[PDB]
Design brief:
Protein name (chain A): RNA polymerase sigma factor RpoD
Helix content of chain D: 25-40%
Radius of gyration of chain D: 26 Å
CATH superfamily of the domain at 828-945 and 1047-1056 in chain C: RNA polymerase II, Rpb2 subunit, wall domain
Family (chain A): Belongs to the sigma-70 factor family. RpoD/SigA subfamily.
Organism (chain A): Escherichia coli (strain K12)
Strand content of chain D: 15-25%
Largest sheet of chain C: 7 strands, mixed
CATH architecture of the domain at 828-945 and 1047-1056 in chain C: Beta Barrel
Chains: A mainly alpha (about 150), C alpha+beta (about 1350), D alpha+beta (about 240)
Oligomer: part of a larger assembly
Bound molecules: magnesium ion, zinc ion
Helix content of chain C: 25-40%
Distance between the termini of chain D: 48 Å
CATH class of the domain at 828-945 and 1047-1056 in chain C: Mainly Beta
Subcellular location (chain A): Cytoplasm
Strand order of the largest sheet of chain D: 9-12-13
Structural class of chain D: alpha+beta
Function (chain C): DNA-dependent RNA polymerase (RNAP) catalyzes the transcription of DNA into RNA using the four ribonucleoside triphosphates as substrates.
Strand content of chain C: 15-25%
Number of strands of chain D: 13
Number of helices of chain D: 5
Number of strands of chain C: 54
Chain lengths: ~150, ~15, ~1350, ~240, ~250
DNA sequence: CTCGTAGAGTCCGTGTCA
């Protein structure tokens, strides 16, 4: 697709060889596609550029210093406030599959939206008690309390 | 032919 | 006698003298890793091998070289304890020196410019600790060895199943260390077909053509010649008498007018002999005999110049006439026969479709890469790369050796790639085997199976990483510039580090260490394995590889193997076995001269061992090594039989070299059935250390070796005298003989107090010596877990009786007394670790505050101001260890709570309670608390207090070490300053500091004193530097996972007592579950009134032939009787003389044994110490196949004043009446396996449910239900229990509305259900509808 | 092997003998481990095939059945009639060897008393109803099935017998893994069945049938052994 | 679902659907862009391959999960197999009101009795105890009853002993070779953690006391209790279903 | 007796359970 675009947008008057122009357009298209449709949770391209630059700088620091790069050192080496680096580190994962062997990872996922049966019994008892108490009161006052 | 199902081989051919 | 040995001597039965002593048990691991690092000059095994294999890197003729120089290993950042506590790996940095050479273009090659980039960092390599374990992520691990099939060429048979018509189909194979597999095979039609590793079949001649070969060349290679000529008529065939054997004469075989053989009679031996004696070479035969031959070389007409005859076609009368008229007088025919020389290559050529080299190459390329066009260059490159490329193919050094020896060559050195000669030899050997000469080889032979270790695997991973890095460097240097780039940015350690980490961290051979006992660790480290990468699989093993090959004798234990799915695939190593330099197992044998058994040991492998005849270990000798009885039992070639005395070549070195350590720790093993011996060997590993482990009364003598070789105990490095002892340290003042010229120094041993093991058991070392006591090199100074005075002690020896007791020992169950539980004999300590992580959530961060909502002071009594439990607090299940609160909001209460809060006006807090609490049912004591805080966060008061304590402790430890060493060095300085002018008065009067300050008027001693002062200042500075390093390490930040702010770890110590439901076992494979705890006054008692500790069923012995337990009981009774005699003699304090005499009599008490004990011991100190140690029972030793005998046991019983029968009269405690049929009473050593019942009991009523399928979350960490399988469904269908099944699979598990309604009904007192439909059916319907199918529920 | 182990466990076994016994020990362990799974698979298939068979009727009023007789191989009896016919229901009235008397009426659950009565006399063959010849469609009836049960009475209506049969067959699965002349082992008469022979001059009967069998009838009319005489055999009596 | 620590877990069907949608969109764009024939044909082939992988995987190329070598899980793999819905969730579901422990001898029992630990019984019968406590007036609200049960007071033990009087339970051993592997007993509360099994039923269960374990289930509905008492009781199964011979002989 | 079917041998391979 990128080479089709390049051939559509080609001018031979300048005399340059078509190889460089076609390579430029193809590389741009491939990089844009990889940035757009490479992750389950898509992220903006500028974040991808920041991550790539951070990785390159970290590799350089690791090679030059030997031991390892810490986030603070990667902070002063870069020109940012040292917190966006932490956020970019935290935003650089990919979803796991539930069929990973361990039984499987998907068998240990609990359902957190359910209400305990004891809670249901407590609510039923509370409803009954409230109905009894309201019936105990007067007519107009109980009606007003219910309406409120 | 080997009756391969790989689209890569067909496209390269 | 060594002091540790002379404190308590084990009486030892056994008659065979020892010539070779047990080697170091953990030698394989240490040797493998040492070879792996092993900086050595010559290029061989190690990192040098990989470095010299990859480098130097050359560009695409770019005139630049990157050449390896050397390498080195740095120093670890953290030691073992720091890595374990922090949770990181223990490794060292790899620093390699690289030199870059660049050439200019273009002129004669020379050193244009070389940049010597120094110390390029390339990842880290994990290190091996002092015992053979690794600390990968704070957890110890063991890299087990692998038993895999060695590279080479192997010939099989594939007999039987093929076509169900007999006619075995032979085949061959070539297995390289790295590369593709070649193969050859026959077929029902006797056609040689060749297969690439697993691709489709092909005729064998395609490869031969691909090697630049023609039909004539192939025929010359694989066939012989027959000579024909026409002496003007009648085909005077040139005959060879030898070739005529094994055939029936078809004509009148005559020569020189004499008819040696006449037509109508088949060739016989006499005819052949007469032809040989008469020297008849040429005969005459009609054209009929020659009509059936095959021509080797093509024939063309010289006059016409046309290809009248080609190679390999059946001849005919017309063809013969044409050739004769064309001037052809000699014709060559292949020598073919139906017995010795079959027409196989000729048939393959006939069926071969290809004709020229290019056609064969095209065919190979198409087969390997079907579906793409073939090309000359592509096919040629593929063929060259497949088998003849040193980069993609390499057999081995061992592979080359095996390949050579299989083909009967005299050289065991060669190249790493095949050649035409090797393939020709393989084909010829396969054809010869097909013709009936030669024999196939069995795979299971241990001469064909090889063993891999940690060093080899790590080197392979490093080589993979280096290959990737080298390819990347080549590409970058070729494409990139080569004028200013320094050789520190073109090499990345990422791939090497990734490969090494992938191997060491996520692999099937790097296994979580087993740490139940010292024995469990020892057996884990000496373990073989046929599984893992490059090995077999559990479900595809077969019955022929899970079997005891005869070659296992002396190399692999035959009775120690798991009893589960993977049986026969583990094969723990033997006792004396080693590993060859090629990786094959060998065992030692004694060299036998003419008739005298010498004492020189030779190690032999299976191949070598097959030839000689090896005698037996239990062969009598008489003080010159002469076989007493002439007919000595031996075993020569996978068999055993009698042999002459002066015909044996070797002899077994010991009677123990057939079993492993685990199976060698079992006394009276020869009286036990094999199955029960296997069960006992497997169970003896699982014993859990008790509060106080004493010793075995009946042992075998392998306890000391196992205890010492394992690193649990502390052993003195040098001799000396104990200078200070404490429950946490031991200080030794080395002897004057073993101290170096300088640095007199002192030995300090720091003991390991209560810590945790991988299995949650307790690890504790306690002192074993006293103040001012001599110690020699190799002695034992501190006991580890489950050892006593340097001996292994896994359980405890109880008083048992064999009889039925009112059905409380009906099955394998056991009946235990109450005095056993009162005395805490089988009590064990378990340590648990709990963690509370404070994360950051979207609403807000979590807190570890001590102010928890809706909870009173009762739960917060044990929480300090910071909100963390105290040290020493005794907590119970349900208590709070660390407090915590989580933010919350927008509860969205329903009207009822609205009205309730309006009436009562109680505020709704926005913070939840998510604190950490003790697991239900477990109660213990807090023994340790640790806090980790992320860098850039405030530290609470508890963390500051803990770090201050840590700093103070570190400073105190360093100061104490410095002061001990300073006392030692002051003694050294006194010694030194005594010379150069001896001043006894000045030394006593002058303070230690003033000794160095003073100096002579003028002498070299002035310079020496100046140097001493400078070195003392340097030592002060370096000690300050160590203190600063420790403080900075303690105060540095924590590298935590993303999203965590604080981590708190709490350690609880739990003391587990014995109760019904716990599992106990002996050493002879006798299991059981405790059934009752009987009162002391209800147990059977003997005449003297002493009850019995345990009661075992007599019905377990006869059906399971393990007679070792009864012999052990008798011998234990004898030993305890001797001990009781000594104790009674000592209570009344008779005198040293009586004790000496009685102990000597007890030690002699033998029939030609090799004990050889005093009198040489100390006057009364040593003898009284020995008597005090023996007052509880004299230990005994009984080797595996050389132990005690019935007569000796009877003598020992008689000496102790006990009934030689082994049975006594017992009385009933509950009635006082005496049982008839005297009972068998004795002492047995029993274990406590870690199948505790507190870890098994589980129950639930309601709880959490899964997410996709709304079913209970089965398991143990969560409640989880019991799975109701299809077998139980069938069982319920067998009855008529429809309602139970319906509720079982409808309301109990999956129907949500049914669950809620059933719970409410049960609470309300109405037992009824409304079934409904399960959720799994709806899920299935939706999933099947997601396809193109349409499934719906009808109705009518 | 050509040499046995001449020792026992009261005495000791030397290295060679114990090494030899390890072979059988390991082989047996592996064999059991694998036979368990094979039996499990077989029982699963058996339950699958016939899991929908139920007793859906009371009596189909049929008259067919299987003719039940004791199984005697050679001169020995491997299975008596009492075990074979106990619990079944007769299809046709059983007549004693002395005809004109009905020993037992038509279909009636043959319990212990009837079996003892039959064994009192010389009854040899009795016809009983079987489930393979039941007229009921979409199930079987109680009379054609019989009695066998954890209970002692006749089968109930609505019982799932296919699952029971599959489980019964599959449960014991893990426990599975010249003569020119014939001589009698007991005195008695000799009975020829489906035999066509001719006497030779020497005084012998020529077996001229390829399906000849030799019986043994006692004084009570009960066979005690069964032998087959191949075509062309020498006769004694 | 999101995991603790900012991590996420997802099903392979998500990535398969993403792939199908992406290739369909690209094919639509190419068609709207008037691309050459070869590109359109290749896009069609890719779309067909993606659809085939989504429906039934492992038939052409067995696409593997990203960043891993394990193959993806197709729609057809969920329904079928030994671990699919039919055999893993429609016949072998987990259940509530159940537990397990190690079995012991207990030779004093009667043929219709078993030994059940107090803790197991309490935690299995919790709801019945709540109902009884509320009925008897000891606890005003279910929360109070829950607190009383959690504190383990004497009245709780008395109520449990009253509610476990004539309520049978089902005991099951792992390999259920025949219908005698499940039977109903009348619990007898004991102290400890091991289940006591009558000696005479070991042969039917095929159980030995050297580490064996067993499970206990509680029938809830009234018809379930009646079925347990009238069909599965240990005193009702004395003859072998395979042959009328007894199965409770002394061993 | 040649040549067509058509059985029938082959057989090589895709598949499905454990
Ligand atoms: Mg058992
Ligand atoms: Zn019927």
């Amino acid at each position: 697709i990128g080479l089709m675009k390049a051939v559509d947008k080609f001018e031979y008057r300048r005399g340059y060889k078509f190889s460089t122009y076609a390579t430029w357009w193809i590389r741009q298209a491939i990089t844009r596609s990889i940035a757009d449709q490479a992750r389950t949770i898509r992220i903006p391209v500028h974040m991808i550029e920041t991550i790539n630059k951070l990785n390159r700088i970290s590799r350089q620091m690791l090679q030059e210093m030997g031991r390892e790069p810490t986030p603070e050192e990667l902070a002063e080496r870069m020109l940012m406030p040292e917190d966006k680096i932490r956020k970019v580190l935290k935003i650089a994962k990919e979803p796991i599959s539930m069929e990973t062997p361990i039984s499987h990872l998907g068998d240990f996922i609990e359902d957190t939206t359910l209400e305990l049966p004891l809670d249901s019994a407590t609510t039923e008892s509370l409803r009954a008690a409230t109905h009894d108490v309201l019936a105990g009161l007067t007519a107009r006052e109980a009606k007003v309390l219910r309406m409120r | 032919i080997g009756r391969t199902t790989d689209p890569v081989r067909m496209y390269m051919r | 006698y060594s002091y540790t040995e002379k404190k308590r001597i084990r009486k030892d039965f056994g008659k065979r003298p020892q010539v070779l002593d047990v080697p170091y048990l953990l030698s394989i691991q240490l040797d493998s890793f040492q070879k792996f690092i092993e900086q050595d000059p010559e290029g061989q095994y190690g990192l040098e091998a990989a470095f010299r294999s990859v480098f130097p890197i050359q560009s695409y003729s770019g005139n630049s070289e990157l050449q390896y120089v050397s390498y080195r290993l740095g120093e670890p950042v953290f030691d073992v304890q720091e890595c374990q506590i922090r949770g990181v790996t223990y490794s060292a940095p790899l620093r390699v020196k690289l030199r870059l050479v660049i050439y200019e273009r273009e002129a004669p090659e020379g050193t244009v410019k070389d940049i010597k980039e120094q110390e390029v960092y390339m990842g880290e390599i994990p290190l091996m600790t002092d015992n053979g374990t690794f600390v990968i992520n704070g957890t110890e691990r063991v890299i087990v060895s692998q038993l895999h099939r060695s590279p080479g060429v192997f010939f099989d048979s594939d007999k039987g199943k093929t076509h169900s018509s007999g006619k075995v189909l032979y085949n061959a194979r070539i297995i390289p260390y790295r590369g593709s597999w070649l193969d050859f095979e026959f077929d029902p039609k006797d056609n040689l077909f060749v297969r690439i590793d697993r691709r489709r079949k092909l005729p064998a001649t395609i490869i031969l053509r691909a090697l630049n070969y023609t039909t004539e060349q192939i025929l010359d290679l694989f066939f012989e010649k027959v000579i024909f000529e026409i002496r003007d008529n009648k085909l005077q065939m040139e005959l060879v008498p030898e070739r005529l054997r094994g055939e029936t004469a078809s004509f009148d075989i005559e020569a020189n007018g004499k008819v040696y053989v006449e037509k109508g009679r088949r060739i016989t031996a006499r005819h052949i002999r007469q032809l040989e004696k008469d020297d008849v070479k040429l005969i005459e035969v009609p054209v009929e005999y020659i009509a059936g031959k095959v021509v080797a070389k093509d024939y063309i007409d010289e006059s016409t110049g046309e290809l009248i005859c080609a190679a390999n076609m059946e001849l005919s009368l017309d063809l013969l006439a044409k050739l004769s008229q064309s001037g052809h007088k000699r014709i060559e025919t292949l020598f073919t026969n139906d017995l010795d020389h079959g027409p196989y290559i000729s048939e393959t050529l006939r069926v071969d479709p290809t004709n020229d080299r290019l056609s064969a190459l095209v065919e190979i390329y198409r087969m390997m890469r079907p579906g793409e066009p073939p090309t000359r260059e592509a096919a040629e490159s593929l063929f060259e790369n497949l088998f003849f490329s040193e980069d993609r193919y390499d057999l081995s050094a061992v592979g080359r050796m095996k390949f050579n020896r299989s083909l009967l060559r005299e050289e065991i050195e060669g190249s790493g790639i095949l050649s035409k000669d090797d393939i020709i030899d393989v084909m010829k050997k396969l054809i010869d085997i097909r013709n009936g000469k030669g024999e196939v080889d069995d795979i299971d032979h241990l001469g064909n199976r090889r063993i891999r270790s940690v060093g080899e695997m790590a080197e392979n991973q490093f080589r993979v990483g280096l290959v990737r890095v080298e390819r990347a460097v080549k590409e970058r240097l070729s494409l990139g510039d080569l004028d200013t780039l320094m050789p520190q940015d073109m090499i990345n350690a990422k791939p090497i580090s990734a490969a090494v980490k992938e191997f060491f961290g996520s692999s099937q051979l790097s296994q979580f260490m087993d740490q139940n006992n010292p024995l469990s660790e020892i057996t884990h480290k000496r373990r073989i394995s046929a599984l893992g990468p490059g090995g077999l699989t559990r479900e595809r093993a077969g019955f022929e590889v899970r079997d005891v090959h005869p070659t296992h004798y002396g190399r692999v234990c035959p009775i120690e193997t798991p009893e589960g799915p993977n049986i026969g695939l583990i094969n723990s190593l033997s006792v004396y076995a080693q590993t060859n330099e090629y990786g094959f197992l060998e065992t030692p044998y004694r060299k036998v001269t003419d008739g005298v058994v010498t004492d020189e040991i030779h190690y032999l492998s299976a191949i070598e061992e097959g030839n000689y005849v090896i005698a037996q270990a239990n062969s009598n000798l008489d003080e010159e090594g002469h076989f007493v009885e002439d007919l000595v039992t031996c075993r020569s070639k996978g068999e055993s039989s009698l042999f002459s005395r002066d015909q044996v070549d070797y002899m077994d070195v010991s009677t123990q070299q057939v079993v492993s350590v685990g199976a060698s720790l079992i006394p009276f093993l020869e009286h036990d059935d094999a199955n029960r011996a296997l069960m006992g060997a497997n169970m003896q590993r699982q014993a859990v250390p008790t509060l106080r482990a004493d010793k075995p009364l009946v042992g075998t003598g392998m306890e000391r070796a196992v205890a010492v070789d394992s690193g649990v105990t502390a052993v003195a490095k040098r001799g000396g005298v104990v200078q200070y002892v404490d429950a946490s340290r031991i200080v030794i003042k080395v002897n004057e003989d073993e101290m170096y010229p300088g640095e007199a120094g002192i030995d300090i041993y720091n003991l390991t107090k209560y810590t945790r093991s991988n299995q949650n058991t307790c690890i504790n070392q306690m002192p074993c010596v006293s103040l001012g006591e001599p110690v020699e090199r190799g002695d034992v100074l501190a006991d580890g877990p489950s050892t006593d005075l340097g001996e292994l002690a896994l359980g405890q020896n109880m008083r048992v009786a064999f009889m039925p007791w009112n059905g409380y020992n009906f099955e394998d169950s056991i009946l235990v007394s109450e005095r056993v539980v009162q005395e805490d004999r089988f009590t064990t300590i378990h340590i648990q670790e709990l963690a509370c992580v404070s994360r950051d959530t979207k609403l807000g961060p979590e807190e570890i505050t001590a102010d928890i909502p809706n909870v009173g002071e009762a739960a917060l009594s044990k929480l300090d101001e910071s909100g963390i439990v105290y040290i020493g607090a005794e907590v119970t299940g349900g208590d709070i260890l660390v407090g915590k609160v989580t933010p919350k909001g927008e509860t969205q209460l329903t009207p009822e709570e609205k009205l309730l809060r309006a009436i009562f006006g109680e505020k709704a807090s926005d913070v939840k309670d998510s604190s950490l609490r003790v697991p239900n049912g477990v109660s213990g004591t807090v023994i340790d608390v640790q806090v980790f805080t992320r860098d850039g966060v405030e530290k609470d008061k508890r963390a500051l207090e803990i770090e201050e304590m840590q700093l103070k402790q570190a400073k105190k430890d360093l100061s104490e070490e410095l002061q001990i060493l300073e006392a030692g060095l002051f003694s050294r300085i006194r010694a030194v300053l005594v010379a150069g002018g001896v001043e006894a008065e000045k030394l006593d009067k002058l303070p230690r500091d003033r000794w160095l300050e003073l100096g002579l008027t003028d002498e070299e001693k002035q310079n020496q004193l100046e140097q001493l002062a400078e070195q003392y200042d340097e030592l002060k500075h370096e000690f300050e530097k160590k203190l600063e390093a420790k403080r900075r390490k303690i105060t540095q930040g924590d590298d935590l996972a993303p999203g965590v702010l604080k981590i708190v770890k709490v350690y609880l110590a739990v003391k587990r007592r014995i109760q019904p439901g716990d599992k106990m076992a002996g050493r002879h494979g006798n299991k059981g579950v405790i059934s009752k705890i009987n009162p002391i006054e209800d147990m059977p008692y003997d005449e003297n009134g002493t009850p019995v500790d345990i009661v075992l069923n007599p019905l377990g012995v006869p059906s399971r032939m393990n007679i070792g337990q009864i012999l052990e009981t008798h011998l234990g009774m004898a030993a305890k009787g001797i001990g009781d005699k000594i104790n009674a003699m000592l209570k009344q304090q008779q005198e040293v003389a009586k004790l000496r005499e009685f102990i000597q009599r007890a030690y002699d008490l033998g029939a030609d044994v090799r004990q050889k004990v005093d009198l040489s011991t100390f006057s009364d100190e040593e003898v009284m110490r020995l008597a005090e140690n023996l007052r509880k029972g004299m230990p005994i030793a009984t080797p595996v196949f050389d132990g005690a005998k019935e007569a000796e046991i009877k003598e020992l019983l008689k000496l102790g004043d006990l009934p030689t029968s082994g049975q006594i009269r017992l009385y009933d405690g509950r009635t006082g009446e005496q049982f008839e049929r005297p009972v068998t009473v004795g002492y047995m050593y029993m274990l406590k396996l870690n199948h505790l019942v507190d870890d098994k009991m589980h129950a639930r009523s309601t709880g959490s449910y899964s997410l996709v399928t709304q079913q209970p979350l089965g398991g143990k960490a969560q409640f989880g239900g019991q799975r109701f399988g299809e077998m139980e469904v069938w069982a319920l269908e067998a009855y008529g229990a429809a309602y139970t099944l319906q509720e079982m699979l409808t309301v109990k598990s999956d129907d949500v509305n049914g669950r809620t309604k059933m719970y409410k009904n049960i609470v309300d007192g109405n037992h009824q259900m409304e079934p409904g439909m399960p959720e799994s059916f709806n899920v299935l319907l939706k999933e099947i509808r997601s396809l193109g199918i349409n499934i719906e529920l009808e109705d009518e | 092997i050509e040499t046995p182990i001449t020792a026992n466990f009261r005495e000791g076994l030397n290295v060679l003998q114990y090494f030899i016994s390890t072979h059988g020990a390991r082989k047996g362990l592996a064999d059991t481990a694998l036979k368990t799974a094979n039996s499990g698979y077989l029982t699963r298939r058996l339950v699958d095939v016939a899991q929908d068979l139920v007793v859906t009727e009371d009596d189909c009023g049929t008259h067919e059945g299987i003719m039940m007789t004791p199984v005697i191989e050679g001169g020995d009896v491997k299975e008596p009639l009492r075990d074979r016919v106990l619990g079944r229901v007769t299809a046709e009235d059983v007549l004693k060897p002395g005809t004109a008397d009905i020993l037992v009426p038509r279909n009636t659950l043959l319990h212990e008393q009837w079996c003892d009565l039959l064994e009192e006399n010389s009854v040899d063959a009795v016809k009983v109803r079987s489930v393979v010849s039941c007229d009921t469609d979409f199930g079987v009836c109680a009379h054609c099935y019989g009695r066998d049960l954890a209970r002692g009475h006749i089968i109930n209506k609505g019982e799932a017998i296919g699952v029971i049969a599959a489980q019964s067959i599959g449960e014991p699965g893990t426990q599975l893994t010249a003569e020119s002349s014939i001589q009698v082992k007991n005195k008695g008469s000799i009975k020829l069945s489906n035999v066509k022979s001719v006497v030779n001059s020497s005084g012998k009967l020529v077996i001229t049938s390829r399906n000849t069998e030799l019986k043994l009838i006692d004084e009570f009319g009960r066979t005690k052994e069964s032998y087959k005489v191949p075509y062309g055999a020498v006769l004694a009596k | 679902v999101p995991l603790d620590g900012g991590r996420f877990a997802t099903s392979d069907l998500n990535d398969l659907y993403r792939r199908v949608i992406n290739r369909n969109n690209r094919l639509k764009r190419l068609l709207d862009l008037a691309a050459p024939d070869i590109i359109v044909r290749n896009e069609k082939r890719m779309l067909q391959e993606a659809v085939d992988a989504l429906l039934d995987n492992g038939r052409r190329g067995r696409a593997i999960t990203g960043s891993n070598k394990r193959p993806l899980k197709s729609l057809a793999d969920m329904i079928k197999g030994k671990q699919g819905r039919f055999r893993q969730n429609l016949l072998g579901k987990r259940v509530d009101y159940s537990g397990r422990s190690v079995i012991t001898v207990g030779p004093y029992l009667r043929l219709h009795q078993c030994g059940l630990p107090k803790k197991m019984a309490l935690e299995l019968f919790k709801p019945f105890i709540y109902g009884k406590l509320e009925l008897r007036g000891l606890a005003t609200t279910i929360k109070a009853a829950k607190k009383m049960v959690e504190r383990e007071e004497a009245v709780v033990w008395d109520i449990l002993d009253e509610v476990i009087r004539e309520h049978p339970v089902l005991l099951n051993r792992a390999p259920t070779l025949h219908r005698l592997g499940i039977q109903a007993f009348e619990p007898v509360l004991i102290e400890g953690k091991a289940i006591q099994l009558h000696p005479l039923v070991c042969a039917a269960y095929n159980a030995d006391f050297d580490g064996d374990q067993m499970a206990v289930h509680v029938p809830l509905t009234l018809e379930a209790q009646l079925e347990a008492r009238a069909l599965m009781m240990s005193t009702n199964n004395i003859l072998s279903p395979a042959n009328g011979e007894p199965i409770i002989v002394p061993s």
